[PDB]
Design a protein around this nucleic acid. Sequence first.
DNA 1: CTGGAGAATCCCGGTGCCGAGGCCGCTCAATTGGTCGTAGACAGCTCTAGCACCGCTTAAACGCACGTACGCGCTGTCCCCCGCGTTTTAACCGCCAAGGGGATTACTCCCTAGTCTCCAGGCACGTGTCAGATATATACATCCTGT
DNA 2: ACAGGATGTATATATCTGACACGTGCCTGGAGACTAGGGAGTAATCCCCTTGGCGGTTAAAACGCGGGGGACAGCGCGTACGTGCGTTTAAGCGGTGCTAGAGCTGTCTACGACCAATTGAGCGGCCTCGGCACCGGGATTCTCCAG
Lengths: 298, 76, 94, 94, 98, 97, 109, 111, 79, 79
Amino acid sequence: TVKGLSNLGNTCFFNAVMQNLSQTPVLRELLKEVKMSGTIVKIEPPLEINLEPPGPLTLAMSQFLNEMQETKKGVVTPKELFSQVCKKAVRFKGYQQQDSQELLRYLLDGMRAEEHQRVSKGILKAFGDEELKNKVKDYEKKKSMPSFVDRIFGGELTSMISLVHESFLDLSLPVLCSIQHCLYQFTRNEKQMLISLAPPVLTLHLKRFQQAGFNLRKVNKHIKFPEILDLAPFCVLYSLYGVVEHSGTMRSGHYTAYAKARTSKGQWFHISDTHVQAVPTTKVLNSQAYLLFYERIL
Amino acid sequence: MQIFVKTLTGKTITLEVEPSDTIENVKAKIQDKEGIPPDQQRLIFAGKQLEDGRTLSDYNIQKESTLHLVLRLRGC
Amino acid sequence: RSRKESYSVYVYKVLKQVHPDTGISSKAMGIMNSFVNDIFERIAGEASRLAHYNKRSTITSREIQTAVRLLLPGELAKHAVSEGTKAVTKYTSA
Amino acid sequence: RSRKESYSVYVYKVLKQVHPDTGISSKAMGIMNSFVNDIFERIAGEASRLAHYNKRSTITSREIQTAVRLLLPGELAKHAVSEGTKAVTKYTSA
Amino acid sequence: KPHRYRPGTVALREIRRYQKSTELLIRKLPFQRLVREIAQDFKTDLRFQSSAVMALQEACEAYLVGLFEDTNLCAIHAKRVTIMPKDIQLARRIRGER
Amino acid sequence: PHRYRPGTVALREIRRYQKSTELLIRKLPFQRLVREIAQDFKTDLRFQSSAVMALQEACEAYLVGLFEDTNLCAIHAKRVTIMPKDIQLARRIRGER
Amino acid sequence: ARAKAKTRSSRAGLQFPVGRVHRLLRKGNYSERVGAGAPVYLAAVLEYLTAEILELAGNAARDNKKTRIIPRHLQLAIRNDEELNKLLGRVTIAQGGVLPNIQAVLLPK
Amino acid sequence: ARAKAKTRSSRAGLQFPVGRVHRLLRKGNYSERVGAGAPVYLAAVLEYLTAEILELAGNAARDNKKTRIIPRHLQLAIRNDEELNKLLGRVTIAQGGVLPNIQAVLLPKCT
Amino acid sequence: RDNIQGITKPAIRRLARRGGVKRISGLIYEETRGVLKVFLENVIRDAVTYTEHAKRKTVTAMDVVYALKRQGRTLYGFG
Amino acid sequence: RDNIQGITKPAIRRLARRGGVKRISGLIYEETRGVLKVFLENVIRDAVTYTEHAKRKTVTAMDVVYALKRQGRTLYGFG
DNA sequence: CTGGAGAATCCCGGTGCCGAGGCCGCTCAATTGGTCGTAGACAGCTCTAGCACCGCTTAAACGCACGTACGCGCTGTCCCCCGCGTTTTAACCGCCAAGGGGATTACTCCCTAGTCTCCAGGCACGTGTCAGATATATACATCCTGT
DNA sequence: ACAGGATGTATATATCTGACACGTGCCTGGAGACTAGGGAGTAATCCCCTTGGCGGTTAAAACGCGGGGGACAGCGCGTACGTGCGTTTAAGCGGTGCTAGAGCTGTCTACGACCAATTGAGCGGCCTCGGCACCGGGATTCTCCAG
């Protein structure tokens, strides 16, 4: 069931990113394999090493989703998770304002970083030199470790000039009118960018921020967006389940989130920190969307 | 080595660096041809935030790469 | 066959001096020894520290008295000071 | 006309090494000096304590290493022991 | 008809019982097993003295008793008699360990 | 007429005084207080300005810490207004009484 | 044939040793030189402290109708006196227990 | 005409003094005799600690866009790092202030 | 005397504001000054005994900070 | 492995009632386990450091008492 | 609100057990006696800083009106924890066996203390420049009322 | 939820202004070379204590069920405390003068470390008895139910 989130004073952006993330069913199962068990993985010399327990960054994330459904109360306090983030980046310590997309990026790569680190640290502590420790990092950084996020949000982008392959986790769409129109704006030939590996869950961003010379103003122009998108010409149907809406400007603003509470379409519930309101899909389509979350259907 | 950079409006601009360069130098080159001040500048490589004090080669950035330039937006 | 030293004999004489017909347990003996050692270390450390404060190189009875005043509070402090002064006076007279 | 001793010069050199173009207030320098003295006293007291504990008579690099492990926890100890070992290795090699 | 005490009377009786005695309230073998397991994370296959593990037991029980007294005071402050975990965080933060 | 509802000015005072660092207690009455408190220990003492400033720094830091502790205690008591009972509870837990 | 050796403890009329305290101060790494009266003062202070510790322990034991001092009696004696509680408020006594107290709110009404 | 006297700090490649800390250990009355590498090790640890403190203070000052480090910056650098806070939890710094924080309960509701 | 009343209501209020207190009951102004006073005779007693042992007629910042140190309240910024 | 569960619920109840607690919630037990585990990590770390400093791999009671003392928890009854 | 039933607790009496008290080598640490180099006591000089006061500004402290948000009191509930009977299991005790690691003894030799000489690094003192404080005019954010 | 107005609040420019990085001269503490001496590093050994195992007991730990009490949510009310405004008041500055004592320097002498010889006091061991744990029985007391 959908439930409210207790704002800490300025974490409405953090509250929103938790709510739409809470509607990711596939992430639930994967975290269960993360916590247990510490299975031994063997790697031939280019090494049977047990798996270290997940770090607190991935830990406090994991228990967070259990209180989303198990707990009877309709208000949840995510104090621990943001506090876990506090040591990760000093910029979040305090009550200075932050942004939704920026929080996600450290949130995302931080999930894999603990997987990146605790696995690499596991062989080093089991086998014991600093040069060897660097070599372990050197081998991995040039290697594509299949992280859990990379199996949920991880995608591969290809740019032609000469084909260059780059992994990605999100799309930052430039803004000059539909989201598809922005999608076309992403893939002109100058130099064409095409995805060959579609992530199971797609995260899309709209650059409503732009500086007109020396004037910083937010693009308040509404964008039209459907629940279903065809991604085959850009490489495939993706169903809308998570929407982030910002209400304000670059300096003063308010973040609201929309979620799809599903186990045909139903149901959209407006989230305002602790305020939970049922809303029709038409109002969702009329919202000033900022981030789009889509689900694999085909 | 040659790496492209995408600005706020989305246009792509060619940049030239060497692996020994630091992100201080990377944003400094942005000052020359963009004029955007460093303190709100932030770049994305493969979905990762780039720590300012580190070096490009450690991020395993090769030629013909692309950077994602966005701004920080405040909202409560 | 190392020989270990404790204050068992001294505290035993004190116990018979106070209560002539009361015994002591072996477990309580270790507790009393630990208490004596802890107080000794506290007073000695404070005395040495004060000697360091005052650019001083000798630990005499004055900074011992000051350390006692620092550690022991109130009634206990002044009674201990009186006992120490009496002992020093008797030693000087002897 | 006494002669006063402090760590101000070395603190300034370290500051220039870490941040080449950053200043420091006189009040902040006194705070840094007090911090350095406090840490030095803590480590020296712990090392001398260890020496008395192990019936030893000399403070060597091992006692200071152990004192660092006891006082500084976690990553600070982890990095400090490495720095001390590399410094003493360089000193011995030179 | 069975005979039953009102809820709380036997609690007070055994509180008085355990506040007058001085035996060990934790079991020796599981405590040693816990100590050895948590010590494995520092040095491999260490060996312990019986007096050492008894000292650890003493310190453990003393610390837990003090923490329980403080958390009971906190709960009574909250106008209640049942301790819930938030009292533990309150006590451990006011003490300064968190 | 313009009128701030209670609570907002308190919040702005909190966010202001948590940003500054000057002395919040008046130096002259603090000096008079410390001088009379030192009176019964020994007569006609003299005090350095640096010593008095250090005393005032220590007292204010101690009081700020105690006020943080009592705010946590009052919040634990499901209140928003602190009361002296929280004060002696904090003192009791910290071993001061 | 010089004279009968009178120990400094007997010189000061004390049961605790003076020479041993002096040796511990000298070898305890506190100062390179120690005054003559310092060991006597320290021994007197230790004797006094142990005197009231044992006195209160004996009073507690006789209140419980036992003739031997045990850690329970020591713990009771330490925690009953406010001055000694202040002195040793951060010290744990093995096999000491706690003083029996129950808050009035918890009592039935 | 003996040799160019290289200071022990340069021998160990340290900025902090080695002779000074050796003299402090010897005259500080901590032990009757002190090993050779002990002052070097102690100076290395002190240099590392002060380097970390100064680096954190510099980042804090840059975040507040002042070019001089002041006790407020020192307080912020010490306390935001939980490790340094644990190391110096019983220390009060003059003109240090307190971290800006307000309990969420005190915050007013929003819509 | 009467200087204990010199620790004024606004001073206590702004101290609580720095500590992070939203609102203060009226019975606390008479308790904060008492506990503060208690801290004062805890500290200056040690300060004056340091001065007396030093054969000095005045109280020094060294003595204050060092008496603070022996109570686990070490102070930085005064030597 | 899995010895923290050896800390039994009745043992927790006995300890709490030695501390003088009337009613104990069901959520207290696992947090008491965690607090005890944290305390052991704090103490045994210093204890094993003390042991290894002496180049001996047997943990004595003296080292445990000394690690307790350095944490402001001095313990009597073990020399 | 006042009595029996019952069950837990405590005191008393006998018994066997062992831990505390007294007695016997013996060895190391205390004592005693000169001796000397030094650290601390003491008197005097100085000049630094604490003391004290006096007059002017004004921001802080104080007293009061109010009205609203908070603490407290009352009530219902239903859910969680306590009290208890059965059953299981492992903590505990007793004993045996190995051996593995802690505590000395001998030797050395290597590291550190000590002394003298040399001088270069560190500190107090002027000194011109740049970071900070202050004034003030801004654009801008935030809260309150009205709708 | 939106608009507008009142009100704090960050910020750019200017201009003073005092703290600070730099240069200079001087002094002693650091470095170097040489020499002695003792402390710990190594090794072997002796044996005390730890680990490990095994088997039997039984008391504690798990489990469960009922039921009762109290934690919590909600509602209402009264008060007290935050917000603002007009009237002191004295804290602060700065400017002045005074002198008390804190620190430095020079003498000097009592004293504590030191070495060598002497000895007796506590330490380890080895007995011996009175305190005490244990078991059982009777007196005491608190609770709990019904009336």
